[PDB]
């Protein structure tokens, strides 16, 4: 039971996994077994979603999060997001589930049967956290793997059938990307966009050419950087700036995953390009705009002149200006005038919403989509009663957007907490005071009084 109690390891059972810090074999076991849990859930969850799936109801009325991910890659779907073939969903689910048994096998072997440390056994697989060279080398391998993953996405989009494109002219459809955006001024220009309203930083990406081109960049950057880290050792200023310890490295990764978690939350909440509304339901801004569109359509059918209709406040009941002059929907949705979506853009001219297009060119498919999106707004109760909070029971609905945003905000937040926990512990343990203050060397007793 090598290190498997508090007396030996110095760590209580509830911090038991800290017993692994310097046991590279068992720690590799933990890691591989864990990757099996992730792959397991992906496969089992997909099969479950498929078993429950009624192809003619929208995905977003069915509590699906994984099928929508698969569909967006262009598997299983046709024009408008119509499901034409569930078999690809099946394949994805099965292949992950089978794969997780392999990973789970490796994990159990390393964790329980293999060498508890790897260093005696192998110098390629063994490691010391304080070995800066081995650390950047392993980091470099993983960078290359990630780079190849990003390029797989490019391969799908360009050579293996394309991606679902909500923006396809004539209507949403799978489309092969042939002219991916390579211009670094566009690709890196996204990184310098404001995260505030009407800008949206990277969340603003609104076409698949930029999406594909960015992963071309990212795949190349990751592979290059991975090579770089295999071939180099950290610079002096790097060595002086960081703590070099397993717990410190966990902490840097915790911060990064926290940040990424927050980013994903805003991505699923606002973006309707890589989270097509055909699959994920309308965004909050989209459904609110769809409501105004719905009543503009209705009342104008009844004979209202929607351009000149002054609402109770003096602002136009249907149509008003944004603070920079663009014609936008009125009522509370004035806040959502940065919204853009395929069903609405045909009505937009260089000055914003165009009154002549509004009066003459609204098609029945736009009315239908706007009514669908208004009535699938991402609002609903924790027990999945769809609607505002005062709604009566009947409609079993919570948008996949709310489930995905809320879950990722919770995760990203607790990951920030773990970052602070571990970054501050790593600092203290590196300096030697993580177990408490030395009673005979209490630093504050050697300092001058404040007053």
């Amino acid at each position: 039971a090598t290190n498997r109690d508090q007396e030996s390891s110095g760590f209580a059972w509830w911090a038991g996994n800290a017993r692994l810090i310097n046991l590279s074999g068992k720690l590799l076991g933990a890691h591989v077994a864990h990757a099996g849990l992730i792959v397991f859930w992906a496969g089992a969850m997909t099969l479950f979603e498929l078993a429950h799936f009624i192809p003619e109801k929208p995905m977003y009325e069915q509590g699906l999060i994984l099928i929508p991910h698969i569909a967006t890659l262009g598997w299983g779907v046709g024009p408008g997001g119509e499901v034409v073939d569930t078999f690809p969903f099946f394949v994805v689910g099965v292949v992950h589930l089978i794969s997780s048994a392999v990973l789970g096998f490796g994990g159990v072997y390393h964790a329980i049967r293999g060498p508890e440390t790897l260093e005696e056994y192998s110098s390629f697989f063994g490691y010391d956290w304080k070995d800066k060279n081995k650390m950047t080398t392993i980091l470099g391998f993983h960078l290359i793997v990630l780079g190849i993953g990003a390029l797989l996405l490019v391969a799908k989009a360009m050579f293996f059938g394309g991606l679902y494109d909500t923006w396809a002219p004539g209507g949403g459809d799978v489309r092969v990307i042939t002219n991916p955006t390579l211009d670094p001024r566009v690709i890196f220009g996204y990184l310098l966009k404001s995260p505030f309203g009407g800008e949206g930083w990277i969340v603003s990406v609104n076409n698949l050419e930029d999406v594909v081109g960015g992963h071309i960049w990212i795949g190349l950057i990751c592979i290059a950087g991975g090579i770089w880290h295999i071939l180099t050792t950290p610079f002096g200023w790097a060595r002086r700036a960081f703590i070099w310890s397993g717990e410190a490295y966990l902490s840097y990764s915790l911060g990064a995953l926290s940040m990424m978690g927050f980013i994903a939350t805003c991505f699923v909440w606002f973006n309707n390009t890589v989270y097509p509304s055909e699959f994920y339901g309308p965004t909050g801004p989209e459904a609110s705009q769809a409501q105004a569109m719905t009543f503009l359509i209705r009342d104008q059918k009844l004979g209202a002149n929607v351009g000149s209709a002054q609402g109770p406040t003096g602002l136009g009941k249907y149509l008003m200006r944004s603070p920079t002059g663009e014609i936008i929907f009125g009522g509370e949705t004035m806040r959502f005038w940065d919204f853009r979506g395929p069903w609405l853009e045909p009505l937009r001219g260089p000055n914003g919403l165009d009154l002549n297009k509004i009066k003459n060119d609204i098609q029945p498919w736009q009315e239908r989509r706007a009514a669908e999106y208004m009535t699938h707004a991402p609002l609903g109760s924790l027990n999945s009663v769809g609607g505002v909070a005062t709604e009566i029971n009947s409609v079993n609905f919570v948008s996949p957007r709310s489930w995905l945003a809320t879950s990722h905000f919770v995760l990203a937040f607790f990951f920030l907490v773990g970052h602070l926990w571990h970054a501050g512990r790593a600092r203290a343990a590196a300096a030697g005071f993580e177990k408490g203050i030395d009673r005979e060397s209490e630093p504050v007793l050697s300092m001058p009084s404040l007053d």
Binding site: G197, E332, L382, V417, L420, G424
Partner: protein, 334 residues
């Protein structure tokens, strides 16, 4: 040494009456900016068109408020989540009408308070302390972020951020109830358990330590004089306190370990308040409290109301009245 080196030495000095530090280099100016703007707006700002419907709400003392009604009012619904710094406005007069001070204050305050949290880590490291006081402060800080940034982002507008004012705060609470049924949300319920239990354990701990202070003073002196700053000996009898509390309930319900006791004292409120913060931050994306409206139905299909339905009626009153000139269409979707 060189100027830079001495500067760094000063910034990081353990000897300054108030610790500065690198977090402090950001915290000091941002907190000063938010404080000064807040005080001046709270006294003297003109009315702010919070809901973007040209219906300005008076927040400041000079424009007819008292301490309880006064607020710095959130920025205009017309702005939404757009960044509205002073230099984006044509004039200070426009900036004021549209609730510019609110954005200035809350952005500087959030940055400054996040740096306050970093600074707590920083000093603990300078003093050779363990590092997690800053993790306890993450709970109130998360809660401030939820109401001033996450909620507005979810709903698409800083006009739905919590106002900087006492009555404004209650306005935010009541509207939040109509829109999310927060009382019926388990994360807010855990927050209540966190703050009521924090109060409870605060009183409990205060009273148990106070009850077992070792006699060191006479009946004329405050017993507080029986403790001297920096003494080595513990000032109360924990075995006596445990002896009492273990009998009040039962032996194994009481801590005799002060470290476990103080960990519990930290953890209970901090965890509950993290769930409070995550309640607001996930209702930000409209995953709302439990809805049992019309859940109980008799043999014919008559609705048999429960206390949940009575809640619903109070929620409806809030919903139909709030921002009474701002809705033109039948659903309040953000």
């Amino acid at each position: 040494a060189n100027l830079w080196e001495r500067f760094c030495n000063w910034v990081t000095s353990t000897d300054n009456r108030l610790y500065v530090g690198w977090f402090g280099v950001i915290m000091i100016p941002t907190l000063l900016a938010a404080t000064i703007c807040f005080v001046i707006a709270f006294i003297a700002a003109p009315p702010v068109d919070i809901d973007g419907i040209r219906e300005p709400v008076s927040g400041s003392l000079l424009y007819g408020n008292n301490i309880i009604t006064g607020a710095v009012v959130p920025s205009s619904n017309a702005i939404g989540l757009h960044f509205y710094p002073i230099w984006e406005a044509a004039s200070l007069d426009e900036w004021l009408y549209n609730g510019g001070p609110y954005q200035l204050i809350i952005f500087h305050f959030l940055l400054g308070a996040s740096c306050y949290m970093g600074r707590q880590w920083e000093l603990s490291y300078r003093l050779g302390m363990r590092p997690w006081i800053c993790v306890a402060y993450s709970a109130p800080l998360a809660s401030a972020f939820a109401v001033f940034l996450i909620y507005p982002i979810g709903q698409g507008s800083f006009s739905d951020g919590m106002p900087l004012g006492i009555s404004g705060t209650f306005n935010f609470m009541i509207v939040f109830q109509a829109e999310h049924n927060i009382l019926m949300h388990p994360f807010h319920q855990l927050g209540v358990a966190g703050v009521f239990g924090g109060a409870l354990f605060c009183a409990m701990h205060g009273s148990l330590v106070t009850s077992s202070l070792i006699r060191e003073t006479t009946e004329t002196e405050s017993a507080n004089y029986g403790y001297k700053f920096g003494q080595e000996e513990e000032t109360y009898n924990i075995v006596a306190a445990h002896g009492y509390f273990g009998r009040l309930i039962f032996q194994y319900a009481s801590f005799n370990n002060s470290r476990s006791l103080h960990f519990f004292l930290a953890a209970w409120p901090v965890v509950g308040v993290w769930f409070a913060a995550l309640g607001i931050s996930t209702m930000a994306f409209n995953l709302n409290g439990f809805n049992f409206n019309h859940s109980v139905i008799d043999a014919k299909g008559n609705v048999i109301n429960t206390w949940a339905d009575i809640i619903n009626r109070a929620n409806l009153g809030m919903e139909v009245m709030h921002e009474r000139n701002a809705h033109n269409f039948p659903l309040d979707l953000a």
